[PDB]
Amino acid sequence: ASGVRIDPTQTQNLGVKTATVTRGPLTFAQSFPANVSYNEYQYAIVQARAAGFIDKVYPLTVGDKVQKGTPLLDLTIPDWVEAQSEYLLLRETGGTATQTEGILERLRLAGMPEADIRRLIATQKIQTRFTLKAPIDGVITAFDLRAGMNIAKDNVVAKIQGMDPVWVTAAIPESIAWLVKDASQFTLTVPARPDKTLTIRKWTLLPGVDAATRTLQLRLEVDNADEALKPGMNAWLQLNTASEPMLLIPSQALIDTGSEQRVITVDADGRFVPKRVAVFQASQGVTALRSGLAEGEKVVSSGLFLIDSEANISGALERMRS
């Protein structure tokens, strides 16, 4: 008779807690670091659509935040004078309505902002003072155009990038990629403000495994409609990833000796019997087995060592192996 028995009033003094066998998915759990990079889908870089020079430069600089349609520069573009001077010349003197659109389009092609051009149709006088609004709603960067200067075609007025649906890229070591399956699910944390619960809009596993640091790229667009997640801030992402359903017993009950790996089945009557098993994977607190125990069997998880000691000495651990 395989297995071996113990006086209940001894296993009652030992505690000997028991856990039953289950079949299902093992839930992989891991965390990773992450920066709160600006949202690069909201990348805007202002440049004058024509040459000229600066008259006024509002109180801004790299670091400040600017909203939709903020006054940046007050420059004077001189390239579009003849266009207007020749336009009003025909507008005041009857002028063919077919000709009017011609020269008025000759402006668009020249570059003149379709709005500043409307300011023209509203009042028939030349335009020389142009105010650069902030194309979108975001933060300034590399603002490298100041007062007393001459602006050029490539002089980047202001590089305003956004931080709503703010991005958070998380790093993942190359030899772990598999921990990221479409069927996954994440939940990030931010130490800066542990008072706010972040909600993820969309996540995507970038196809570019960063070369500098041998890591995978995982971008995360997350709602920041109150400006709480400052770009650059740290962020800990923790993922959960289901696994091809195996059998699962608590890891607190699997005994590995390198050579073999066993657990201790319990019987109807209670004859503690060791049973060889093949482990598959473990994490979070439980371990899976590719095979070994029948779903439903009872497994010892507490005070197991002394039980195995008795079982080893009882030679029940030797008869099993044969």
């Binding site: 113990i6 006086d7 001894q10 296993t11 003094n13 030992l14 060592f305 002394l306 039980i307 195995d308 000691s309 008795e310 079982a311 080893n312 000495i313």
Partner: peptide, 8 residues
Amino acid sequence: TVRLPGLA
């Protein structure tokens, strides 16, 4: 009395 499994 003082008896535990695997404890001689």
